[PDB]
Structure 1
Amino acid sequence: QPVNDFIDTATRHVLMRQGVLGIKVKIMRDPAKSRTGPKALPDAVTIIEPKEEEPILAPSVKDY
């Protein structure tokens, strides 16, 4: 499906003196810009980066 989604293909027939040539063009668009559709490949698996903690600290409690 991402093919449907992200690649755009066109074949044109250039008619030259000696015969004709077939031109095929493929363009793959950046998924991260998709504006209106999946923002990535189905493949894509990002893990959010954890936060270096400064734990310890014996109990205590705030009052408001």
Structure 2
Amino acid sequence: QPVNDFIDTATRHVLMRQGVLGIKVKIMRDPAKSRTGPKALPDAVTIIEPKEEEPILAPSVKDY
């Protein structure tokens, strides 16, 4: 599927003295800025990287 989504594609018969050659042109528009589409390859997997901690510190308790 990604195909249908992220790649523009053309062909053009550029015609000439000798003959014609097809031109055929493929582009990848960055799934980053997809605006209203799926905003990256399905292929992706980002984690989120945690946070260092200064944990422990035996109970205690606050009061307002």
For residues 37 and 18 of structure 1, the distance between their equivalents in structure 2, rounded to whole angstroms, comes to: 44
- Structure 1 gaps of 5+ residues are none
Structure 1 runs of 4+ with >6 Å offset: none
Tell me the CA shift for residue 56 of structure 1: 1.1
User: Across the two proteins, how many residue pairs are aligned to each other?
Assistant: 64
Matched residue SS, 1:26: strand
* TM-score (norm: length of structure 2): 0.97
For each residue in 1:1-54, what CA deviation from the matched residue of structure 2 results, as whole angstroms up to 9, or x when unmatched? Answer: 100010010000000000001000000000010001000000000000110011
Q: Extract unaligned runs of 5+ from structure 2.
A: none
Identity rate, percent: 100
- 2:16, 2:34 → 1: CA distance? 38
SS at match of 2:48: coil
Root-mean-square deviation over aligned CA pairs:
0.5
